[PDB]
């Protein structure tokens, strides 16, 4: 990881919170190409001091995204570990998380937009699968919109997948249960069951999000009822825009070995026209 000096980073507005983290917009003063000075917008993720013990895992997640380079993976600029703070310095994606964007723009997003975003996410996951790299936290909040659809010039939307944050393999059980139904059943049974099939399940849940205008599946269920939801082997209801319901249910297979490869998922996606 490239170590960035605290002097070169300026914290600005809070954008929200992750698990044991606070997230801010910031500015990084840097020497760019040809020696030109730039003040670059950045995303600053800060681990809560009270959870400093997760630091390793906190950085491990980010490490996963920087091992490979891909057009659909958010860039990591480096880390600031100056002092007692642990800071991730990442690319600032203009339009932010996809779930917020869907909730705000639901009244003007059709099937073609959803299908393009789904294809891009599936392509990112196919890249990860071919590299045998587990993401571990696919969800609409971790999809970021680089640019919007422009029907005037035919441009499709473009998305990037963000880093997964602290791994579910080390998170407390109640956080895992709160993350049903993104966390697959076998990881609720044993968090060390984290596997490639995990991301296929979570991809199904994320498709449900994309199709549901930013609604959160099973949000009306508390943790005990989410557990019970997995115990009775229920599936998510089809979204009112049901064009992807079969794909969602095929990915959210209670048998991890039966979840389809992302190549087959991409084939299915392309078959809808
Ligand atoms: F606060 C968060 C930040 C990210 C995130 C991770 C990695 C890179 C990111 N780049 C930009 C933005 C971002 C945030 N807002 N905006 C603009 C859009 C509208 N104008 C203001 C800025 C851009 N967010 C990024 C992911 C999250 F998961 C949350 C946590 N939450 C996710 C759901 O929404 C609330 C925050």
UniProtKB/Swiss-Prot annotation:
Residues 9-273 form the Protein kinase domain. Ubiquitously expressed throughout most tissues. It comes from the Eukaryota. The modification Phosphotyrosine is found at residue 34. The record marks 174-175 as: Breakpoint for translocation to form PCM1-JAK2 fusion protein. Autophosphorylated, leading to regulate its activity. Also phosphorylated by TEC. Phosphorylated on tyrosine residues in response to interferon gamma signaling. Phosphorylated on tyrosine residues in response to a signaling cascade that is activated by increased cellular retinol. Undergoes Notch-induced ubiquitination and subsequent proteasomal degradation which is mediated by ASB1 or ASB2, the substrate-recognition components of probable ECS E3 ubiquitin-protein ligase complexes. It is found in: Endomembrane system; Cytoplasm; Nucleus. Possesses 2 protein kinase domains. The second one probably contains the catalytic domain, while the presence of slight differences suggest a different role for protein kinase 1. Non-receptor tyrosine kinase involved in various processes such as cell growth, development, differentiation or histone modifications. Mediates essential signaling events in both innate and adaptive immunity. In the cytoplasm, plays a pivotal role in signal transduction via its association with type I receptors such as growth hormone (GHR), prolactin (PRLR), leptin (LEPR), erythropoietin (EPOR), thrombopoietin receptor (MPL/TPOR); or type II receptors including IFN-alpha, IFN-beta, IFN-gamma and multiple interleukins. Belongs to the protein kinase superfamily. Tyr protein kinase family. JAK subfamily. Interacts with EPOR, LYN, SIRPA, SH2B1 and TEC. Interacts with IL23R. Interacts with SKB1. Interacts with STAM2. Interacts with IFNGR2 (via intracellular domain). Interacts with LEPR (Isoform B). Interacts with HSP90AB1; promotes functional activation in a heat shock-dependent manner. Interacts with STRA6. Interacts with RHEX; this interaction occurs in a erythropoietin (EPO)-dependent manner. Interacts with ASB2; the interaction targets JAK2 for Notch-induced proteasomal degradation. Interacts with MPL/TPOR. It is linked to Chromosomal aberrations involving JAK2 are found in both chronic and acute forms of eosinophilic, lymphoblastic and myeloid leukemia. Translocation t(8;9)(p22;p24) with PCM1 links the protein kinase domain of JAK2 to the major portion of PCM1. Translocation t(9;12)(p24;p13) with ETV6. This is Tyrosine-protein kinase JAK2. It comes from Homo sapiens.
């Amino acid at each position: 990881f490239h170590k960035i000096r605290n002097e070169d980073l300026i914290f600005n507005e809070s954008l929200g919170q992750g698990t044991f983290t606070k997230i801010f917009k910031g500015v990084r003063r840097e020497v760019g190409d040809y020696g030109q000075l730039h003040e670059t917008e950045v995303l600053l993720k800060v681990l809560d001091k009270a959870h400093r013990n997760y630091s390793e895992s906190f950085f491990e997640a980010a490490s996963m995204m920087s091992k490979l380079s891909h057009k659909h993976l958010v860039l990591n600029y480096g880390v600031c570990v100056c002092g007692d703070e642990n800071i991730l310095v990442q690319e600032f994606v203009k339009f932010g998380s996809l779930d917020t964007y869907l909730k705000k723009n639901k009244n003007c997003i059709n099937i073609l937009w959803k299908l393009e975003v789904a294809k891009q996410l599936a392509a990112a996951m196919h890249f990860l699968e071919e590299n045998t790299l587990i993401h571990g936290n696919v969800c609409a909040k971790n999809i970021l919109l680089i640019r919007e659809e422009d029907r005037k010039t035919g441009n499709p939307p473009f998305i990037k997948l963000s880093d997964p944050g602290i791994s579910i393999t080390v998170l407390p059980k109640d956080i895992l249960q709160e993350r049903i139904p993104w966390v697959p059943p076998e990881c609720i049974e044993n968090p060390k069951n984290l596997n490639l099939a995990t991301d296929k399940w979570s991809f199904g849940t994320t498709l449900w999000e994309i199709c549901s205008g930013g609604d959160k599946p099973l949000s009306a269920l508390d943790s005990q009822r989410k557990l019970q939801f997995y115990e009775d082997r229920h599936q998510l209801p089809a979204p009112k825009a049901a064009e992807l319901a079969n794909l969602i249910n095929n990915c959210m297979d209670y048998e991890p070995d039966h979840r389809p490869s992302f190549r087959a998922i991409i084939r299915d996606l392309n078959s809808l026209f």
